[PDB]
Amino acid sequence: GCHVDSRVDHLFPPSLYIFVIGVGLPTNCLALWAAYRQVQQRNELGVYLMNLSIADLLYICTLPLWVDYFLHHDNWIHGPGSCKLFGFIFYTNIYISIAFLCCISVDRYLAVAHPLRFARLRRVKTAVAVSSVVWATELGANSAPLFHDELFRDRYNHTFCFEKFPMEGWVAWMNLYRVFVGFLFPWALMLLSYRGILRAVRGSVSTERQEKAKIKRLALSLIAIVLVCFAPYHVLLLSRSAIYLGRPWDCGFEERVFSAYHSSLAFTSLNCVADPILYCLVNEGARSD
Amino acid sequence: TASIAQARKLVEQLKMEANIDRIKVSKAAADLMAYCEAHAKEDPLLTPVPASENPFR
Amino acid sequence: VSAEDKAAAERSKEIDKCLSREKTYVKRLVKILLLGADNSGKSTFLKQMRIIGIHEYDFEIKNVPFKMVDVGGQRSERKRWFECFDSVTSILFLVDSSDFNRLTESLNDFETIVNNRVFSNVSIILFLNKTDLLEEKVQIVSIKDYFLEFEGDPHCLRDVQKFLVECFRNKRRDQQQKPLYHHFTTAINTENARLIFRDVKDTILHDNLKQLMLQ
Amino acid sequence: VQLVESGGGLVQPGGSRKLSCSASGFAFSSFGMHWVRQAPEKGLEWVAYISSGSGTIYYADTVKGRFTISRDDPKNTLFLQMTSLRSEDTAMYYCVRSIYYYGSSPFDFWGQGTTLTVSDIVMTQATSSVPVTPGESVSISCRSSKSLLHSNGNTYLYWFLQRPGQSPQLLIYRMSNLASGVPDRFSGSGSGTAFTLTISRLEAEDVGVYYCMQHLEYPLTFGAGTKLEL
Amino acid sequence: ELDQLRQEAEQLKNQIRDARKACADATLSQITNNIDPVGRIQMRTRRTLRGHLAKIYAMHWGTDSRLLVSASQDGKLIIWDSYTTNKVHAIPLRSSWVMTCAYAPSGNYVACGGLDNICSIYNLKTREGNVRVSRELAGHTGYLSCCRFLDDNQIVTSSGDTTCALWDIETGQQTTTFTGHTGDVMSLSLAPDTRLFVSGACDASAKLWDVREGMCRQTFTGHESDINAICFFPNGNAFATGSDDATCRLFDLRADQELMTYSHDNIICGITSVSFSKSGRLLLAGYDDFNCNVWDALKADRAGVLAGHDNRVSCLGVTDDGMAVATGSWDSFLKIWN
């Protein structure tokens, strides 16, 4: 609830989104195309790849309109309709996207570690069933903010969509859920899962030196890129939330994080390019595809 | 002389093959293509038939 | 459509469900092809297998369906028709290791079957049988009298074992795409089933890795 | 093969009773089953039908909700339940076997049945009992209202024969085809709504009552029949 | 002496060769060159018969042109209904390896064979309602490749032990035997007159045998590999064969010469099955190029490709009435074309 600093960060978010949409859209489109062939060959992992491709494009499609929130400098003058619709998509689907990256990791642990069990769990019919459950659950948990209108006037006739810098409302508590559960828990399953597969390959005999090196490269690649594109944003998000939860009087640190929050939000969108290229282009067979 | 017998039957098997009456290639070629002209209007694979009588249709 | 084609459709649906029931059991099946000589001890191995034309024997280990096919007198077939067993995942080769004259012919037979192009997706496993006499003839019989490359003294058990393993491994051409396991087991041992299961487990693990992750 | 029926006897008005049918000598699961009743000195009537695997059950419109039909595969037994008996239900019952697939012979075997005593497309089978002497040829015609020529090119009409003291036996199925173990002298043909059975050179063991039937759509219909005898 | 026997054999070979050279006047292409082209032929998949579990190897039609029987390597004999896509029977099997099937002209029996070295015959019509085996023929020392019916009690069997024989069903013992092929016989067909039959035995050789006489009449040699398929021209004086040389051929039993060489440069794979058409104007052939191709009898110019499979076509058949053509391949699907 005080004057914030935003002069340092003006064009970094809007300009970056232009680069991402130009590059992200084709990469996930061909990733979607390759995912279709996988399930066409009775492979489960094509389904989970297919879902991730569509969701990433939707976030990409909502960017050209959000950059207008940084280009037109209209402070969300479009109207309440966009604020309760498009703000929902911006702050929800990134966290559905993480879920599928966990779903693939658990599936791979059920093939390399134990390739002669869980036949019913690896049916394609079952895979779609769990896919629907994950889809529905994510929407319901984050649906609450959209029902309540979020439009607040600022000092220079500005208006923040889905945001306010007095931390008024129940957003502060729900942000705790969005970080502790929506970030750490799925990333925790990624680390435990991908460590187990490397343990099994070490005991393998048919594997050679060349193939062993590659799987080690990919496993640490997937467990590091997730933290790079997400951790800086959520670390500050807990800190700025901690100010209001602990000392509502203090506002200077709330002012400074306003500079980084818009800066950190743009950097998170780079993960929309990590998912397609790291699951399609890396694979030699998919590269031949 | 079983092997000699096997060669023996081979010679006779040729002696049936020696005495076969034959015809001319042009005469033989005439027989084949003539059969095609006769049944030209009876083969659905050549000429598609209308969908009404077509059972699989 | 006529109160009779409806019953025909119901009969068809019942047959379809009966087939779909067997589909699941068909999917989770592992097949093994056994090829061996007269002295290889295949009869003894099959006898000890069940105590715990084309004949078929079925058995279960760790709740997994297995299937062994025995082919006797049909190994001489060399035409494309006989290559209908193109869905098996592993081929066993019981071989004698006692008589060094029979070792040669076993080597030519191994060369005959392993280099065939259709069996390019089978994990070849080689069980060295006997291996109780060979411990008793190393200090008595010299294996140098039959082959002329063995550097180690034929009385050295380990050196003889390495000799035989290298001779069998080098026989395969086209480098190595699928692996070739080997063990030194007799017939009284009971862990051979576990060894076969472990080898098949590794083969399926490699196939799953290639199919899913590295691609 | 042998089919037996039991569970019949004298009853008082009201009450309930369960019938039993025994099967032995064939695959009981594959075949469907029917129930057919006969008044003392009258025609026949269809009651119910349970399909293979107990999938679908159909009932007659004359009586419904008071009858129950079920089957027991492992014991090869068929049983039927009755409640609230009425005077119209005084009849001697029959059991019928039928299978359904391309080129089949439905309604082939009939059981002897049992007796019981308590205290739609229409056919025109004129009775007009025709006296006949051995060696003469006869023709019997059954009439139907709705055309029986379904577009699939199949006529659905059957024929039956019942000697006195016996059970009905199939003679001709689907308007042209003869059944198993029947003399070649029996012959029949016709067209839509025009049905005739042309017998040639009558012999002994031909006395009885004949019947005609439809199978186009449920429910099923019978006819009175004619007594071909002198 | 034996050397004199060799000399006599060579002399007889020379006599046959000289006669065959003398009988030639011109080429079938020269005789049939002014004939109008048949034209472009485009067909479409009308019905797909799914339901199998493993690879399909062969199928056969029936006289009624409605019912067909298919067999797979999972060990099931399924009888289909083409028009309504309704299964009629599903006969379970004992041996899980089979490579042939047949349908009796009367419609009361079916047959199959495989690596068991034993022929099996099933009775479809039964009072009980369960299909049961009637006879189990035995006596061969090699794998059974193809079997066909002639009557309700006469069957013809070809085996890999270089023997072909005729059996009596009720009697259960062979009546006549045929010897003379050096290699193992693969495929056979029966003439419409039901008095002669021809077969090929992987030695680039075709021999004609007589059911009652019991000795081979003629021998044809024009290929360079194993023969995989054979079938009779509609009339009964010609037969066509295909091999691994990626080439088909047509012969005449009276002229005793090969006439035409259906060939193309792109094809580098083998021929699996070959069948004619109703009027003898089409020669359909199943290739290993994951597709099937259509040829012409008097022109040998390609007409159309019946592509649409994902694997190797293994069987092919043309209905008696001349309506549809069926294909079966290792994708565990049958398709009915028109």
Author numbering:
A (entry chain R): 8 to 296
B (entry chain C): 6 to 62
C (entry chain A): 5 to 56, 68 to 230
D (entry chain S): 2 to 120, 138 to 248
E (entry chain B): 3 to 340
Question: Mind quoting what the paper says about this structure?
Answer:
Among the over 800 known human G protein-coupled receptors (GPCRs), three specific receptors — GPR4, GPR65 (T-cell death-associated gene 8 or TDAG8), and GPR68 (ovarian cancer G protein-coupled receptor 1 or OGR1) — were identified as proton (H+ ion) sensors regulating signaling within acidic microenvironments. The three proton-sensing GPCRs exhibit different responses to extracellular pH variations, and each receptor has distinct preferences for G protein-mediated signal transduction. GPR4, in particular, is responsive to protons and engages with various G proteins, playing critical roles in angiogenesis, endothelial cell inflammation, and cancer cell metastasis suppression. Conversely, GPR65 is activated at relatively lower pH levels, primarily signals via the Gs pathway, and is implicated in chronic inflammatory diseases such as inflammatory bowel disease and certain tumors.
